Amino acid sequence: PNFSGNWKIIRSENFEELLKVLGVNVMLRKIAVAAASKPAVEIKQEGDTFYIKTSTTVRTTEINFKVGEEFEEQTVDGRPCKSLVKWESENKMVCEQKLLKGEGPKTSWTRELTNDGELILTMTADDVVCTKVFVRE
Numbered sequence: 001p002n003f004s005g006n007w008k009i010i011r012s013e014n015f016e017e018l019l020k021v022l023g024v025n026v027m028l029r030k031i032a033v034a035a036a037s038k039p040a041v042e043i044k045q046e047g048d049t050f051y052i053k054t055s056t057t058v059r060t061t062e063i064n065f066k067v068g069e070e071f072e073e074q075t076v077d078g079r080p081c082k083s084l085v086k087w088e089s090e091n092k093m094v095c096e097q098k099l100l101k102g103e104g105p106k107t108s109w110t111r112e113l114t115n116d117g118e119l120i121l122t123m124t125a126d127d128v129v130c131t132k133v134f135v136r137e
């Protein structure tokens, strides 16, 4: 597959519930959920090397990783973590995350290119799964 491109959101589910289980107060959540409903995503992939930029009106993240190599990033709520991405299947990556400090919900994410040309991002905290679906811009 090639994830490379600019991606636009077409569906979001369960992002408020995800932030809820992470313990974000309703007021800050409200700012976040609205902004996260319109994220713009740029991916540059060369083989196992990835750059992913996710931009919203309230927060932008930029990560560089290589599939199979540990790296440091932040959880969806900004907590520093170490992460490892692997290919779960041909067009699907899964990232497992461990907090650098302290105790917290177990978090992960997955990104998959689907047969129809879309991209599915999932983000999980404990049991709660957020799904966001994108199409190329």
Ligand SMILES: CC1=C(/C=C/C(C)=C/C=C/C(C)=C/C=O)C(C)(C)CCC1
Pocket (backbone or CB within 6 Å): 019, 024, 028, 031, 032, 033, 035, 036, 039, 054, 056, 058, 059, 076, 077, 078, 121
């Ligand atoms: C403003 C703000 C937040 C916003 C988070 C957002 C907007 C996350 C968007 C995530 C997306 C689009 C992920 C795609 O991979 C936090 C950190 C929850 C709480 C602190 C204040």
Ligand code: NA
Pocket (backbone or CB within 6 Å): 063, 073, 109
């Ligand atoms: Na990430």
Ligand code: NA
Pocket (backbone or CB within 6 Å): 054, 061, 075, 076
């Ligand atoms: Na994020």
Ligand code: NA
Pocket (backbone or CB within 6 Å): 110, 122
């Ligand atoms: Na999944």
